[PDB]
From a paper:
The spike protein displayed on the surface of [name]-[name] functions in the attachment and fusion of virions to host cellular membranes and is the target of the host antibody response. The receptor-binding domain (amino acids E367 to Y606) of the S1 domain is responsible for binding to the hDPP4 receptor, and the N-terminal region (amino acids 14–366) is known to bind to the cellular receptor alpha 2,3-linked-sialic acid. S protein is the main target of neutralizing antibodies (nAb) in the protective immune response to [name]-[name], and various human monoclonal antibodies have been developed as [name]-[name] therapeutics. Of these, [name]-F1 was previously isolated from B cells of a Korean convalescent [name] patient and was shown to neutralize [name]-[name] in vitro by interfering with the RBD of the S protein and hDPP4 interaction.
Structural analysis revealed an asymmetric unit containing a single RBD bound to a single [name]-F1 Fab to form a dimeric biological assembly. The complex comprised residues Val381-Lys587 of RBD, residues Gln1-Lys232 of the [name]-F1 heavy chain, and residues Glu1-Gly210 of the [name]-F1 light chain, with a chain break at residues 579–580 in RBD and residues 107–108, 145–146, and 207–208 in the heavy chain due to the lack of electron density as a result of the flexibility of the regions. In addition, two molecules of N-acetyl-D-glucosamine (NAG) formed separate side chains through covalent bonds with Asn410 and Asn487. In our study, the structure of the [name]-[name] RBD complexed with the [name]-F1 Fab fragment consisted of a core RBD subdomain comprising five-stranded anti-parallel sheets, five short helices, and two short-stranded parallel sheets at the C- and N-terminals. Eight Cys residues in RBD formed disulfide bonds in the core subdomain (Cys383-Cys407, Cys425-Cys478, Cys437-Cys585) and receptor-binding domain (Cys502-Cys526), resulting in RBD having an overall globular structure, and no free Cys residues were found. Structural analysis of RBD in the complex with [name]-F1 Fab confirmed that [name]-[name] RBD clearly binds to [name]-F1 Fab. Both the heavy and light chains of [name]-F1 Fab participated in interactions with the key residues of the receptor-binding subdomain of RBD. The key residues Asp509, Arg511, and Glu513 in RBD bound to adjacent residues in the heavy and light chains of [name]-F1 Fab. The carbonyl group of the Asp509 main chain and Glu513 side chain in RBD respectively interacted with Lys59 and His60 in the heavy chain at 2.8 Å by hydrogen bonding. Additionally, an amine of the Arg511 side chain interacted with a carbonyl group of Tyr115 in the heavy chain and Tyr92 in the light chain at 2.7 Å and 2.8 Å, respectively, by hydrogen bonding. In particular, the positive protruding region in RBD induced by the Arg511 side chain mainly played a role in the hinge buried by both the heavy and light chains, enhancing the overall interaction between RBD and [name]-F1 Fab.
Numbering used by the authors:
A (entry chain A): 381 to 578, 581 to 587
B (entry chain L): 1 to 214
C (entry chain H): 1 to 106, 109 to 144, 152 to 232
The structure:
Amino acid sequence: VECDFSPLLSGTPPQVYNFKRLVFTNCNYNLTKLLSLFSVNDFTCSQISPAAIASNCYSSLILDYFSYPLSMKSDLSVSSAGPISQFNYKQSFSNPTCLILATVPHNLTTITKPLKYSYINKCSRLLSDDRTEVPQLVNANQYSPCVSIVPSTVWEDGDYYRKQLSPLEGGGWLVASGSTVAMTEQLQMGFGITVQYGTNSVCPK
Amino acid sequence: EIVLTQSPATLSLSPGERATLSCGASQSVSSSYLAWYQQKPGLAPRLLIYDASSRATGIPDRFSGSGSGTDFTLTISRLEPEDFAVYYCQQYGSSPLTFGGGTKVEIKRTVAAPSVFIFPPSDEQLKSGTASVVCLLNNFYPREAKVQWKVDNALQSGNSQESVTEQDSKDSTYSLSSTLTLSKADYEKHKVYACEVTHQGLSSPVTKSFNRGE
Amino acid sequence: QVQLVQSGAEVKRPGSSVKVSCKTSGGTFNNNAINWVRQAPGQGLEWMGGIIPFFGIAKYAQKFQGRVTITADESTSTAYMELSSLRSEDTAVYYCARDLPRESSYGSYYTHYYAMDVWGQGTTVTVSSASTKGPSVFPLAPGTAALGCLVKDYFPEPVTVSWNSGALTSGVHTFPAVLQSSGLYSLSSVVTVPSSSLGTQTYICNVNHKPSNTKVDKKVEPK
Ligand SMILES: *[C@@H]1O[C@H](CO)[C@@H](O)[C@H](O)[C@H]1NC(C)=O
Ligand SMILES: *[C@@H]1O[C@H](CO)[C@@H](O)[C@H](O)[C@H]1NC(C)=O
């Protein structure tokens, strides 16, 4: 049984705050073939190496992917402190991880472009006292608490989204603001890989 | 509401002396969320101290704050001339935000009795049907003074109003007016119009008077 | 460099409403909450409420709940306080003031409505049933002599008084106005001068009440 990466190659990759997760156990993978379909602009890892991530056996392999503009490379890093890692997407600090920035070649036709890149520039809660603010920093392997009030793609840079919470949900307010980056001629993407060592049935082919 | 009580109401001190200002809260001020402000006449308050003890940007070192819970203190180690003003504490540990009633820091100087002057109504005003009688207490210290109007010896009540200047920048005195208002008809029922002044710099009360029509 | 600039003085009748504006310049809103604080003549300071720009949600002191609306327009960087069912006891200077900005909680939470480090210049709001009216100006007729001018029965504030077109300043005391039971203001301005001067020197008080465009020069002489 081969690990099935093909959902990645068909359709429009979501924006970073809606990153799509594929999880793999008990299967065989070929990461070097998958990456051969893209033009890889950056490939950096933490507690592992690009050579190792393609060659080892794991008890679990998780691959996150999304549209992402190369111009925001500095905001997609295990060292970053900007809106992406604070509010949109954050990897595990304990398991080995890699981050890959890539471009869809004209070769690759089954991946479709959204109208622009979008990200959450801030998600925050105002508590029921109407005076205490709690910025909603995203947890590793989780989505922002604002994904339900932010559209699939932000229409205009600076749009606001606001939701009053019922008392059963804590009361107060949940507010997000969205930012956009103009689409590029070729779609640019981000990939996040997280591996775990356990019984290690995720092995290279 | 957290009630903030400032004391003393007035501090009277000389340039170079140390000023100690207190603020007491009716209940504990959470997280030491207490600020101090300076306010001069006609101007907006100016933040000096926040979070009980942190100096705001640009505030000189002679200002410091301390305290916690329900007792807080603003200290000015050595007063400069520009430090004479009103000071307010403010708590933001609980909603609604509340302020103290203020402490005035004024320049202490030697006791000075007022010069007292009385002004009859102008003839033009009287003919138009009203009599305003003005008593002036000029350049005295300290601020406390008592002014009584007596009309043919009868003490007046309810028909006079007082106004006081801010402390003078150069001699550190105050001046005060008191204005007695009667109808023309009521004014012409009496003869002697007198304002009687009591002040610390006066051995006995000073009276200035006139006789209507003389 | 950050400044808060408020709209100008207002005069309102009881039962009406007033809306005061406050524009931030010299910097961003940067999610610093805007507070509204008022000060009645001779009194201390009272927090009415505020708004947090990121959320567009306002908070009010219970004593004003139902009567005050605070809003904010990020596109013009302007906040607004609207107070309704005005009463004469709402006569006051109304200040907008910004929370002291602090490092972002992204601590782990962030408290709005704080110590306030930048304040507007204030907006005077007078609530009264009086109509605009210029003052009558009467002489306070005169070692040391004292003389002056009584500036009586005008509405609204303010009036200015000078002596001899500003050439006479030493020994002048212009008193703060009092509000009379009629609802009109009155003040006196006085000066002390040498008694020897009363024969030779002319004394004129220049009174200006802009709301009624009243301008009066009154010569004060001995009776
Ligand atoms: C995996 O993909 C790479 C990339 O083309 C290829 O060289 C290699 O032969 C593949 N291995 C297997 C077992 O298919
Ligand atoms: C598609 O074209 C790209 C050009 O960047 C090339 O690197 C890649 O090997 C091609 N993939 C195929 C033919 O599957």
